[PDB]
Design a protein around this motif. Structure first.
Motif: not given
Ligand SMILES: Nc1nc2c(ncn2[C@H]2C[C@H](O)[C@@H](COP(=O)(O)NP(=O)(O)OP(=O)(O)O)O2)c(=O)[nH]1
Ligand SMILES: [Mg+2]
Ligand SMILES: [Mn+2]
Ligand SMILES: [Mn+2]
Length: 539
Positions: A317-318, A320, A346, A366
């Motif tokens: 998983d990428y 942020q 985050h 987070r």
């Molecule tokens: N606008 C919006 N975009 C979102 C939301 N949730 C996810 N995205 C978009 C923006 C996110 O960048 C992307 C991937 O979501 P994750 O993998 O769950 N979070 P991230 O990659 O940011 O952090 P980490 O992996 O380090 O925990 O999807 C939201 O509530 N709103």
DNA sequence: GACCACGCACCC
DNA sequence: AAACGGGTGCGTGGTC
């Protein structure tokens, strides 16, 4: 077209008719091909599949998936849907693409083959001189369709006995909750009917209405409204618990075990390649991109997704991702520095929200901080922010000011993006994927500002989607060489299956492919885990 | 049986 | 619910 005997010569465009939309479950009712002014109809479509070297035409991937189901390595090739989708991602259906670019989507394979040929010619012509869209077609979308075909045909293993047992336990808890709700209401009703619940809450119990529903203006009973009434009456807590359990049981626990394919013994989703306005994939029939993960019961459900015996799941998983993409697109020096320093925005927002050290930020914190960070970025109002965090309006407004003041080129990039979208009528990703947003010049402010939020979100979300797609295209041949499988994509995440003896090597290689797919002004970091089930593979 | 609109809950 | 964005699936209520 001149009717000619099956088989067609190499390079012909295929048309086909399925008994139902899902290729892993469909009966292939008819098959045909078109080329050189001729149409060739297959007397028996299943045997005729063996004569094709490639599925070239509308919905090519779906025919490829069915071919793979039947043990035939028939790769998808050109698909007019992908050309149309790149010209304008509102082109999502064969019905609409046909009417727009020169034919009619019928229920006859021969006509679908001729239509595929004609639309390809016309759409290819429309892409002449669109060098960036052509790059996306040749380097991302067309190769990706072959990757997705393999993923769909492979499926994922599911612990069905585990979910069957879980259903029975959840049923007994649902009965406890509903009985208590009916007691508190003073009478039974259909707790699944939000119209009946509205009357109970706001007319019979006299609770304050907090908001109205969009289309019909009813008094809302949504989670956001119930959470604000948590302390108004004990029935509210029971309703929220009932809502979670029935959602999870009705959408995941009960239906998924019934969808195991009899030949593969696995669960097969569809990865829809021309379905979103930003270039993301979607998943359906069943959606495997919204499997629960947040709550304890949701986590129990995610654990049902397991590796084959002798194999392990690998989840990548990428980190942020959209904040990293924003740094590159905007060129904001401060935001670039944040990630060059290995910071986690985050976690930092979570520390501030809950008032605890970064050491003490659990996954729920987070996750809540993630919503705040992206909510604020893409235009959340100070009023809603103040409501979300239970803090004074002046404080929420100050958080937003500090957010943007930290990264001044972001607002400049937003205004540059919106002005360009107004003048051109479309915005675009780093790679040139376009979304048309005509409402940027609407005279009704609510409509205009909604269009604005859609418009400047798309380059960020869409660039992240481009990167993920490109990474899948690069990674897939490497996994084949290692005897590993690509199973699922969840927007910025991949789930792989690897033989136990090679799982560590697969994890390391996949991480490196994803991190180096297309270097930006900021490093892309990928979190990777290995486990027997999907939850355990995400650490 | 199918379709739809809607409200709502799940995910990124 | 609200000036975050992008998605899909279920049950209700209504219809055919
Ligand atoms: N606008 C919006 N975009 C979102 C939301 N949730 C996810 N995205 C978009 C923006 C996110 O960048 C992307 C991937 O979501 P994750 O993998 O769950 N979070 P991230 O990659 O940011 O952090 P980490 O992996 O380090 O925990 O999807 C939201 O509530 N709103
Ligand atoms: Mg029991
Ligand atoms: Mn991520
Ligand atoms: Mn993710």
């Amino acid at each position: 077209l001149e009717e000619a005997p099956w088989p067609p010569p190499e390079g012909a465009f295929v048309g086909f008719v399925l008994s139902r939309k899902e290729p892993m479950w469909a009966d292939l009712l008819a098959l045909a091909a078109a080329r050189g002014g001729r149409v060739h109809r297959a007397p028996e479509p299943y045997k005729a599949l063996r004569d094709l070297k490639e599925a070239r035409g509308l919905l090519a991937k779906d025919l490829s998936v069915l071919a793979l189901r039947e043990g035939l390595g028939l790769p998808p090739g050109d698909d007019p849907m992908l050309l149309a989708y790149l010209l304008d991602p509102s082109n999502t259906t064969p019905e609409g693409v046909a009417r727009r670019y020169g034919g009619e989507w019928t229920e006859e394979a021969g006509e679908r083959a001729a239509l595929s040929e004609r639309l390809f010619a016309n759409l290819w012509g429309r892409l002449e001189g669109e060098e960036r869209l052509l790059w996306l077609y040749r380097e991302v979308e067309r190769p990706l369709s072959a990757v997705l075909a393999h993923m769909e045909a492979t499926g994922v293993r599911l612990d069905v006995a585990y979910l069957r047992a879980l259903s029975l336990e959840v049923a007994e808890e649902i009965a406890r909750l509903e009985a208590e709700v009916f007691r508190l209401a003073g009478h039974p009703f259909n707790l699944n009917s939000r119209d009946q619940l509205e009357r109970v809450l706001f007319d019979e119990l006299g609770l304050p209405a907090i908001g109205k529903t969009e289309k019909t203006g009813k008094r809302s009973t949504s989670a956001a409204v119930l959470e604000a009434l948590r302390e108004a009456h004990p029935i509210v807590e029971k309703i929220l618990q009932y809502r979670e359990l029935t959602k999870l049981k009705s959408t995941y626990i009960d239906p998924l075990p019934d969808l195991i394919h009899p030949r593969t013994g696995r669960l097969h989703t569809r990865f829809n390649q021309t379905a979103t306005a930003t270039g993301r994939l979607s998943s359906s029939d069943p959606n495997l991109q919204n499997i629960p993960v947040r709550t304890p019961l949701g986590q129990r459900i995610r654990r049902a997704f397991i590796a084959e015996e002798g194999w392990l799941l690998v989840a990548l998983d990428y980190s942020q991702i959209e904040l990293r993409v924003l740094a590159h697109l905007s060129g904001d020096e401060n935001l670039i520095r944040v990630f060059q320093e290995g910071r986690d925005i985050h976690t930092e927002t979570a520390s501030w929200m809950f008032g605890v050290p970064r050491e003490a930020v659990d996954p729920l914190m987070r996750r809540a901080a993630k919503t705040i960070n992206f909510g604020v970025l893409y235009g959340m109002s100070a009023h809603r922010l103040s409501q979300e965090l239970a803090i004074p309006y002046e404080e929420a407004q100050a958080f937003i000011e500090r957010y943007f003041q930290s990264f001044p080129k972001v607002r400049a990039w937003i205004e540059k993006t919106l002005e360009e979208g107004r003048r051109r009528g479309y915005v675009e990703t780093l790679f040139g994927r376009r979304r048309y947003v005509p409402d940027l010049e609407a005279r009704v402010k609510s409509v205009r500002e909604a269009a604005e939020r859609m418009a400047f979100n798309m380059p960020v979300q869409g660039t992240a989607a481009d990167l993920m797609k490109l990474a899948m295209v690069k990674l897939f041949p490497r996994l084949e060489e290692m005897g590993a499988r690509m199973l699922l994509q969840v927007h910025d995440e991949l789930v792989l299956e690897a033989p136990k003896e090679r799982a560590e090597a697969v994890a390391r290689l996949a991480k490196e492919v994803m991190e180096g797919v297309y270097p930006l002004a900021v490093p892309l970091e990928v979190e990777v885990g290995i486990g027997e089930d999907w939850l355990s593979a995400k650490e």
